[PDB]
Design a protein around this ligand. Structure first.
Ligand SMILES: CC(C)(COP(=O)(O)OP(=O)(O)OC[C@H]1O[C@@H](n2cnc3c(N)ncnc32)[C@H](O)[C@@H]1OP(=O)(O)O)[C@@H](O)C(=O)NCCC(=O)NCCSC(=O)c1ccccc1O
Ligand SMILES: CC(C)(COP(=O)(O)OP(=O)(O)OC[C@H]1O[C@@H](n2cnc3c(N)ncnc32)[C@H](O)[C@@H]1OP(=O)(O)O)[C@@H](O)C(=O)NCCC(=O)NCCSC(=O)c1ccccc1O
Ligand SMILES: CC(C)(COP(=O)(O)OP(=O)(O)OC[C@H]1O[C@@H](n2cnc3c(N)ncnc32)[C@H](O)[C@@H]1OP(=O)(O)O)[C@@H](O)C(=O)NCCC(=O)NCCSC(=O)c1ccccc1O
Ligand SMILES: CC(C)(COP(=O)(O)OP(=O)(O)OC[C@H]1O[C@@H](n2cnc3c(N)ncnc32)[C@H](O)[C@@H]1OP(=O)(O)O)[C@@H](O)C(=O)NCCC(=O)NCCSC(=O)c1ccccc1O
Ligand SMILES: CC(C)(COP(=O)(O)OP(=O)(O)OC[C@H]1O[C@@H](n2cnc3c(N)ncnc32)[C@H](O)[C@@H]1OP(=O)(O)O)[C@@H](O)C(=O)NCCC(=O)NCCSC(=O)c1ccccc1O
Ligand SMILES: CC(C)(COP(=O)(O)OP(=O)(O)OC[C@H]1O[C@@H](n2cnc3c(N)ncnc32)[C@H](O)[C@@H]1OP(=O)(O)O)[C@@H](O)C(=O)NCCC(=O)NCCSC(=O)c1ccccc1O
Lengths: 275, 275, 275, 275, 275, 274
């Protein structure tokens, strides 16, 4: 693929090619753990993808292999900056801003695919989970660590995981903090497919292209519909929001607008009350 | 208004005029209690209204006053035909088919307004509740009777009532089986407005007309949206269904249709992936 | 089995034998796509099955093989009659009446089993999904096509699917519009069992008989309970409706009815307030 | 009424009369604040009432007036024994056992009526909220104090309050920590009725007697149904639990039991599959 | 108050004083309708407020009176820039970005109070609703207009409104598109208090100061708890996120961090498994 | 090294380190529970909950029986089933297993079902509501309600669906078939499968991996999982844990001290974080 750099960052790499964006967490010396700046940059990059009318799919992955030969998607919050009440940014502010990133990935009307090679651990595991889809390399390793390292994600990390692998397996994952292979992760329902490491990016590109040939309006409505099964009124906001969008493409709707601007009463008399 | 009979029934009366249909429960010797046939006919009448592209609003009310001077919207299930496991129809089958009627009124994409003069009691009270709106006459009397007469409605009768008057008041209504005035009913939030008896139908017509001047598409989407706060996936079905409806009016959607019929790949390349 | 024709239709075939009904979509020249009339007839047949006190289980399947040797359960909405805002009926009205069929299948207190040979695609796929159970032949092929053909089902097609195969696999199914084999469908959780094509009906009959040897009241309560995990207040309506049904079979409840009819205060004094 | 002491406690008083139980919080020197012992005892008394087949209604109230002439329902958690992580019991164990009491009151199949004279503040306010009904004396004063005293009830204290007074008023109550009169509390929807201080107990008894003349089975099903609008699967458990109870009173149900005991196949062939 | 300008914008004004921020929509020639830029700026200012450790409360209001003597909070989407599929920004992109602003106001851990003088109509009405609290001047006018002007808000505008005024009144508001006085709005439950126009800001400041003397941790937890009753897993994310925040302030939690950094197994053996 | 912790008629109850073991001991009825069995089970689980050293509870059945067969639990004892419920010795109809279900589900300790042989009917639902399930390869799972004139439309239905999905959950209940340990794992309702003589050791092994974790983290997580299912009751548990943690902060303590000292609280130093 001919990837073009789209913007420069300190902790990540960001590329575009056709309708695909690629976001790479680039802190291999920390197994691609995120510090607050990493989350800020990830958020910025995902926002850019959201605003780009040409991009329909974002591939999210980690830099590797590292000098020690190991692969990693993301090892979660950088523990070396963890202080009282959160992860300390350069101004001394404790933060949990990955929560904001989680929501953006979840709600943006573009499909996000996690491409996992090596470790997807802790907060890194939850990031893989909230991505729409996950493609794993056969060397991928999945797991949570919260109860061992003094943390937990009781939001999407728990409930949404249960909506993927079911309640028994979700609890096992969090309580024991074991590691799971790519094959185990696929069998339990949380990984869509598994390929060799050297095929991981091309598979992502293949899946991305099958989506890029579909109707953008259809895709965004379906993504909202899936969220609507989880996120109550916030889910309804996204789903109803797309209904409003589509309604704003109708003549019936436009008559309401035109009537207001022309200071006359609207005339919906020709329009039927359908069953 | 020039109401014209639209179809003949044994237990009810059914009229249409302009964009309004009027359905009248007609068993005043039973304070308008419904027997299984009454529910069958009500259901049929609402279906007819649903199918008529000219009808946007349905007024539901009870026949009166009766020979005793009393008014009644509906007194619920006819206890005189109640047998083992439900209300016995003319074929000997026990039924709780008012549940089907509740669902039809609740889901049909037309506004239904209960016009309550006199008693709306028991199953008759639940009917008023599931109508979109309620306009009451000053002589209206509301209440549940289940725990006194060996019944209960633990479906929309309970949960949906709580979404109207709040949990404290809903529990009071059901546990004590007291009666409530039109003013008390409005104050608690379950009656939209109150007018003198002789003004009841005309108020109904005025409210119907204010809705009939609105966009049918906007109205149906809103009704689905309101149901969506209550009915989980069934509510999602109605709201997403309207999104599908609207999407079927877009050129983007039509390309998908035409491509299939012409046995060619669709080309959505021109359409943007909006924010 | 000695199937007996139960009623004649244009687009479907309808049989009964013992406690089993069999409904067959009969438009093999369109891979059994449904037009509005097809849905009307399916709805009528399911209502009949619902009304028949002898029928406990309904088998739903597609006519085949076709003259080209191919099998199909259902290929979804007939694209050849699709117009603005829906599928255009013979009177010129745009419809999405499959939504009503979905609700009927989902809520009727009889077990519905989809018998899928060959294609269950698009709206045909959602139909299989909303059936209680699915038995597949080895030649079955499952998938959604919405984003490719300019449609989507963001109701039961999305949310309820996620409650079967989990969020990751449900999104994949819709975003990519691939086809899935029977073994794949079974592994992901949406097909209950797989058998050879010529053993499909006999498998359906056997499963039906195992249900028919059970308590009808127990089965209906369970079906409502499953819906209740999905359909919010609509689900409560079904579950509470069954509690009412059962309560109408009690002596305690009848004392309430009798008291009213005999115009005396009820006497529940003998009855305990159990823990 | 002739109240009889039913069991002796240190921190509360417990009486019975006919089908009514009365539980009185008795620490007037602390405006009836609860310490862990108080909660243990309250739980015990409510359990007793639950196990007593003669008791249908429980009245909950505070001892008063105090020597200063002041009335109090309950001032919440006893701050004088609050320590690290909770309220410290006599063994040094930090506890939040009022959460267990909230659940018992909420789920027990008997109606609980809070009789509030004077202060219902903090955890004392939440206690009034979770009781089925609330009757207030003219001198009643309601409010939350968490954000002022370094606490919060983000459980039934927040969500369930919103289901009573609506989201705007519920947020106001908690954010500002003001006090509300009986009239204000009634108008907002969280108090069922208001009576003079010296009529409070008689009003409680009158409401209780109106409940005690109803069907105990109807009442328990209704209470479960109301919970089911709030408590997801736990609510389904209560409601389905009652359906099971009712089914266990049927001959159809008994056929299953007998068949098992007699080591024979059950015969449900005579029973219909109702609509 | 000595308000200080905090940042310069085109469509709005932004001030700070003590723990209070004030955001003023400043397009009085359009009754304070928002165009995409207005939303962009509102979003930025609310983000600024969120990031300011000194700000606990945000007052949101409209500029007025206008040259015509009229007051307005906000009249919703600027119809003069509405085009196909949304509101057209300065780059030609159709947007519904008020949806993003809604989520920010709803989720940010500071109390937002709408100060409504004059019109809060359509999208402007939904903005007032999603603020935590609303204080109205006695000249305030509330209402929705969607079905008249060819729009609807089927997200928070519908469901969340029902959680404030109940289902009956919410439907009325949307279906008829009438106007409601401050008094009617308070009576129905969606306005917290009403004061004279000349007292509106001082009342806002008064309420803000009562919140500013409270515990910030308590307030954020409560706000998340209220959202959790509406927003399913998204609500859980906020509520669990705060639990994580608090857990990150515990010694027990830090031991997990330290063990990881020091490359040793954690020792939680000293910590109890509390009831 | 198990130590008897309390004596019961229908069950056995032990502790060792941070693990409690509760054993249903009515093998002559395939460990069916009568109201007393449930009362004792509730009592034992309450004990475990109240025991500050206990972090994990293993639940299992006595076996093998004299007929060589294993059983976790065969559900409600049909031999005492009467009108409206299971008749206790004072003549009262009961459904008190529902109370046990809630206790197991809500207690801030991990409960692991160790299933050898039959987990059937109400016994099957008990395994389901336990946090985790470890099965021996001879384990057999299933529901029987519609066959024996009962049903569990609460956690037995909805919660099962949140484990195996709607299609499989309905199959299980409608047909009342039996499922192997391997089948149970493949569908998602069993965490792992081992040989029968390795069953207890696997449970102990799993318990220990949990006992080395943070008790606060584990309780918050269990509540968080319940919250995806139990609406406001789930919120009560989750928010309750937030309150617990807030009661460990200085900020929170200022509010208490201020009240006790009859002075206005001073939270002025504390930030309004993002
Ligand atoms: C990822 C894993 C399993 C890999 O193990 P291994 O291959 O053995 O690598 P190693 O552990 O040796 O790590 C290599 C270097 O990267 C650092 N490193 C790795 N992960 C790090 C991290 N998360 N923070 C800081 N440094 C890290 C290491 O400390 C080490 O650095 P040096 O000693 O060479 O200097 C293994 O490394 C591992 O278990 N990492 C920890 C993962 C973890 O526990 N994450 C959860 C923290 S909580 C969280 O993510 C979170 C944050 C916000 C909101 C919610 C949340 O749940
Ligand atoms: C409605 C009410 C309060 C009116 O009282 P009142 O003005 O004193 O009239 P009265 O009680 O004298 O009744 C007049 C005649 O109509 C009959 N009548 C009135 N309502 C009836 C009914 N529901 N069934 C059969 N006959 C009825 C009466 O029996 C009486 O007949 P006669 O003595 O002249 O022969 C007062 O009449 C009253 O309280 N009726 C009871 C209403 C009630 O308790 N409904 C609960 C049944 S449960 C239900 O609605 C339901 C059904 C299916 C599914 C779910 C459900 O919740
Ligand atoms: C089913 C499938 C995959 C089979 O492929 P194939 O075996 O190759 O058959 P072929 O494509 O040649 O089709 C055979 C004939 O049946 C027609 N045909 C098949 N399906 C049709 C349909 N759904 N409508 C009209 N004509 C159809 C075809 O046009 C063709 O006719 P002729 O050339 O001989 O004239 C393959 O045929 C296929 O993919 N069909 C379309 C499936 C599809 O995209 N369905 C969903 C549309 S949206 C939906 O159902 C829906 C409905 C309600 C609510 C929400 C919704 O999303
Ligand atoms: C209740 C109220 C408003 C009454 O005011 P007032 O009439 O003026 O009485 P006063 O404040 O003087 O109190 C009288 C005496 O009772 C004690 N007292 C009153 N309430 C107490 C309490 N809750 N704990 C310990 N001692 C108490 C006082 O400290 C005082 O004792 P002495 O000086 O004579 O020694 C006014 O007293 C008041 O606001 N009290 C505090 C109420 C409060 O803030 N409760 C919340 C605690 S957090 C919570 O309840 C909670 C706990 C567990 C779970 C969830 C929860 O939400
Ligand atoms: C607010 C209201 C009721 C006041 O009426 P009035 O006092 O009589 O003022 P007037 O109607 O004359 O309007 C004054 C000027 O401001 C403009 N103006 C007022 N509102 C405007 C608006 N929303 N957009 C553009 N220009 C506006 C007017 O066009 C007029 O301009 P000029 O003629 O002098 O040039 C009355 O003005 C009124 O009803 N306005 C429209 C309210 C409305 O229908 N809002 C809904 C739009 S849909 C939406 O908000 C939305 C957007 C995104 C997502 C969800 C959503 O619901
Ligand atoms: C478990 C199972 C499949 C074992 O089969 P098998 O190995 O062949 O043993 P067998 O059937 O011979 O039973 C052995 C003895 O234990 C008794 N026994 C076994 N289970 C019993 C039980 N549950 N109650 C009373 N006695 C029992 C039997 O009657 C038999 O006794 P004797 O002949 O020696 O006298 C097989 O035994 C079996 O299917 N048992 C019945 C399981 C069942 O249907 N449970 C459903 C009750 S519903 C419930 O649990 C419930 C409770 C509360 C709320 C909701 C609910 O759904």
């Amino acid at each position: 693929m001919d990837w073009h750099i789209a913007k420069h960052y300190d902790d990540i790499l960001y590329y575009k090619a056709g309708g695909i964006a690629k976001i790479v967490i680039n802190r291999p010396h920390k197994r691609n753990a995120f510090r607050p700046q990493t989350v800020f940059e990830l958020y910025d990059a995902f926002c850019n993808a959201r605003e780009d009318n040409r991009i329909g799919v974002v591939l999210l992955t980690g830099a590797g292999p590292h000098s020690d030969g190991k692969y990693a998607f993301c090892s979660g919050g950088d523990q070396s900056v963890r202080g009282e009440g959160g992860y300390i940014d350069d101004q001394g502010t404790p933060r949990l801003n990955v929560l904001d990133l989680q929501r953006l990935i979840r709600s943006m009307p573009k499909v996000v695919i996690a491409l996992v090679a090596g470790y997807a651990i802790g907060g890194g595991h939850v990031l893989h989970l909230v991505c729409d889809l996950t493609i794993a390399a056969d060397n991928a390793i999945f797991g949570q660590t919260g109860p061992k390292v003094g943390s937990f994600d009781g939001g999407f990390g728990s409930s949404y995981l249960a909506r993927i692998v079911g309640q028994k397996k979700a609890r096992e994952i969090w309580y024991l903090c074991r590691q799971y292979s790519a094959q185990e992760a696929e069998r339990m329902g949380m990984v869509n497919t598994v390929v060799p490491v050297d095929r991981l990016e091309e598979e992502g590109i293949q899946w991305a292209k099958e989506i890029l040939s579909k109707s953008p309006l259809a895709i965004r409505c379906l993504k909202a519909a899936f969220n609507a099964d989880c996120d109550g009124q916030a889910g309804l906001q996204e789903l109803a929001g797309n209904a409003t969008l589509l309604y704003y493409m109708t003549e019936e709707g436009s008559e309401g607008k035109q009537a207001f601007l022309e200071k006359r009463p609207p005339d919906f008399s020709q329009y039927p009350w359908l069953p």
